[PDB]
Amino acid sequence: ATTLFWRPVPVHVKQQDREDVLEELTFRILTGVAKQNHNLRILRIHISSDSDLFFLHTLEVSEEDFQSLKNDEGILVDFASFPGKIISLLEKCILAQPGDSPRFQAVLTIRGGESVFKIVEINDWRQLPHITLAFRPGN
Amino acid sequence: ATTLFWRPVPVHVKQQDREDVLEELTFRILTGVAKQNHNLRILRIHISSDSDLFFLHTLEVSEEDFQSLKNDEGILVDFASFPGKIISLLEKCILAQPGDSPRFQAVLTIRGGESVFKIVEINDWRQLPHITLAFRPGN
């Protein structure tokens, strides 16, 4: 397994009955293959906190999962190229933060048993979701 | 009730085990109020076909529904302004169609008991969803 990205990112954390709050959360993005299962390619992403070792949300998407995801979401690149697009968006979030009103923002909505991560672009009327991914607590 | 929009729009229709196909589907967008229920404001949208009178998909969103929708989707305008933003996006779909590869496209995915309507913008790697709305068959 290869680590493509490993660092804190500014994330707007949303919880029911709480004000949105900006926190630096660490993202680790890995790619690898399950050779035992006919070389199944896998993308794994972890969201953690350097200052709270028990905070963890995980996503794992296989190339099989991606076949449907690609169609449903209108993704126009292959599975090998997909993580690079996520990383480019995270890089935009990092750069934008020092600004008065960041154009690109990372957003994590935490609920029971599941969280939803998005990277959004603020336009004239909404936060446009460039990517939306479901994470499971822990691991 | 006031009609804000009523005309055909080019829609890319998607169905399981079928090629995507471009069809002109008629959209009617109405706004009104249920005065009996403490002046509840309502947005109604119908997707129909001039050439098939039995084809119909409907959405109805009240201002109460919008409170959650606005938060979950990061919409930054009020309920009164929301339909105008949808209409601006439909107008972009109409204008783009005569082009070799339309930048903005309307997409309707039809499934059992439900359809999902989106207006997307083609960028370097995906169809970016400017709006995503669930429709129910018939009415």
Which of B126, B127, B132 is the mutation pick for testing A, counting most A CBs within 10 A? B126
3-state secondary structure of B31: strand
- Which two tokens mark A35? 């050779």
Boundaries of every domain in chain A: 1-139
Contact (Cβ atoms closer than 8 angstroms) between residue B44 and residue B30: yes
Contact yes or no for B73 and A126 at CB 8 A: yes
Contact (Cβ atoms closer than 8 angstroms) between residue B20 and residue B13: yes
Nearest in space to A79 (alpha carbons), one of A100, A95, A65, A99: A65
Angstrom resolution of this structure: 1.3
**B114 CA to centre of own chain:** 13
Say which experimental method was used: X-ray
3-state secondary structure of A2: strand
3-state secondary structure of A65: helix
Buried b (16+ CB within 10 A) or exposed e, B35-57: eeeeeeebbbbbbbbeeeeebbb
Gap between the Cα atoms of B65 and A25, Å rounded? 32
Q: Which of residues 58-97 of A touch B (CB under 8 A)?
A: 72-77, 81, 85
A71 Cβ neighbours under 8 A, 6+ residues apart: none
Residue with tokens 């204008």: B95
Gap between the Cα atoms of A60 and A74, Å rounded? 20
Gap between the Cα atoms of A125 and B85, Å rounded? 8
Contact (Cβ atoms closer than 8 angstroms) between residue B132 and residue B117: yes
Nearest to A130 among B73, B85, B128 (CB): B128
Does the beta carbon of B98 lie under 8 angstroms from any beta carbon of chain A? no
Does the beta carbon of A122 lie under 8 angstroms from any beta carbon of chain B? yes
Q: List, comma-separated, the residues after which chain B is broken, a break being a C to N distance over 2.5 A; otherwise answer none.
A: none
In sequence order, the β-bridge partners of residue B24 are B10
Residue with tokens 């601006």: B88
Contact yes or no for A122 and B76 at CB 8 A: yes
Contact (Cβ atoms closer than 8 angstroms) between residue A43 and residue A33: no
- Which two tokens mark A92? 């935009």
Which residue intervals of B3-81 are DSSP H helices? Answer: 63-73
Angle at alpha carbon of residue A78, lines to A127 and B124, rounded to 5°: 45
Element (H, E) at B95: helix B82-96
